[PDB]
């Protein structure tokens, strides 16, 4: 069982970049993790290595004392974060996949295979937005660079009523509107 | 924790004593751009677009991992050999697109809260193993430093088949079988 599983010691190093407002704001944080414990880190906003837990003092002290290493780390905001952002700008940041909108019988509007993440899916009854009986799933990450989201509508079909699912996404200049009648 | 328009990991580095084994990959806004096969010493991009326009020196990954190994052994001692604690993983199965009998689809198996990063994810059809059309992502990072991984099974919806995503992990009391039907 879990108590007699093989012993494992795990190490993780995460070099992360944070981008806001295009290239206006850039921040990096490198994380040194033992098992699941982040014990030391470098935050470009702080400018020096800092111990996060009792395991980090020896590391943060030693690394801040290495002039070249310290300068190299501070310089990664440029050699890594800024440098790679330009590369994202010509590939990832331009990736656009239009959502496929489908409605099936209470009523489920399936918005599948889209990218980026930003989307707005709403239900309308006779061109009037539904404010209740609407439940959406969280944004679903497929792992293959596409997302999915399902929004259901609890309704009592009365004759003549026309239900529509409105979907807005950056890959679309015009909202996608799908109708459904009983 | 940190809010930003975009978050990237230009260095999800992993190394663990069990095996031993390691992993090197880059992620942007939660998805994997690539991973470096440490055996074949090659970079494997996850999108045709990337494979076509960008490149990464596998050696940087290999060199980084040797450093994580050096760091791990030292922290293992500084922590008096505190070993990783197994987390209980959670499994979820869903289709990539709406299910219409006869039309090609893909079953997705999300295995979340994985730790340590060692796991077996396999598929079952009508109770028996299936390897044809199966694939999976690398271990994707999480801010709490556990991981998640997604497996895929390309299939053709039919009334003659029911599936199961089987997950084996040291943290479980028994193998997990998450069922899914057309």
């Amino acid at each position: 069982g879990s108590r007699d599983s093989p012993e494992d010691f795990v190490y993780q190093f995460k070099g992360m970049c944070y981008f806001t407002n295009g290239t206006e704001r850039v921040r990096l944080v490198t994380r040194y993790i033992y098992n699941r414990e982040e014990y030391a880190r470098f935050d470009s906003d702080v400018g020096v290595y800092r111990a996060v837990t009792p395991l980090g003092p020896p590391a943060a002290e030693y690394w801040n004392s290495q002039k070249e290493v310290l300068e190299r780390t501070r310089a990664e905001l440029d050699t890594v974060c800024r440098h790679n952002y330009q590369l994202e700008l010509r590939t990832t940041l331009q990736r656009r996949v239009e959502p496929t909108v489908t409605i099936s019988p209470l009523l489920v509007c399936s918005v599948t295979d889209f990218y980026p993440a930003q989307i707005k899916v709403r239900w309308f009854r006779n061109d009037q937005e539904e404010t209740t009986g609407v439940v959406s799933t969280p944004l679903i990450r497929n792992g293959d660079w596409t997302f999915q989201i399902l929004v259901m509508l609890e309704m009592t079909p009365q004759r003549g009523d026309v239900y529509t699912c409105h979907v807005e996404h950056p890959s679309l200049q015009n909202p996608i509107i799908v109708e459904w009648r009983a | 924790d940190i809010v930003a328009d975009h978050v990237a990991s230009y260095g999800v580095n992993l190394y663990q004593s069990y095996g031993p084994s390691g992993q090197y990959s880059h992620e942007f806004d939660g998805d994997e751009e690539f991973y470096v096969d440490l055996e074949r010493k090659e970079t494997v991009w996850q999108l045709p677009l990337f494979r076509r326009f960008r490149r990464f020196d596998p050696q940087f990954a290999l060199t980084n991992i040797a450093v994580l190994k050096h760091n791990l052994n030292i922290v293992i001692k500084r922590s008096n050999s505190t070993a990783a604690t197994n987390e209980v993983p959670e499994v979820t199965v869903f289709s990539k697109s709406p299910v219409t009998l006869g039309q090609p689809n893909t079953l997705i198996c999300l295995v979340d809260n994985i730790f340590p990063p060692v796991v077996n994810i396999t598929w079952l059809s009508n109770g028996h193993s299936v390897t044809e059309g199966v694939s999976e992502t690398s271990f994707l990072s999480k801010s709490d430093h556990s991981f998640f991984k997604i497996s895929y099974l390309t299939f053709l919806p039919s009334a003659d088949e029911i599936y199961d995503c089987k997950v084996e992990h040291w943290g479980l009391d028994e193998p997990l079988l998450k069922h899914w039907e057309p």
Binding site: F13, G15, L28, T30, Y32, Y49, P58, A59, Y62, W63, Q66, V69, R72, T73, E76, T79, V80, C81, H83, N84, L87 | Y10, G11, N13, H26, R54, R55, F56, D57, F60, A61, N64, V67, L68, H70, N71, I74, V75
Partner: peptide
């Protein structure tokens, strides 16, 4: 152009 990569600092034994 080559992709950038964060380089890990080395622990002192």
């Amino acid at each position: 152009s080559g992709e950038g990569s964060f380089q890990p600092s080395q622990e002192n034994p």
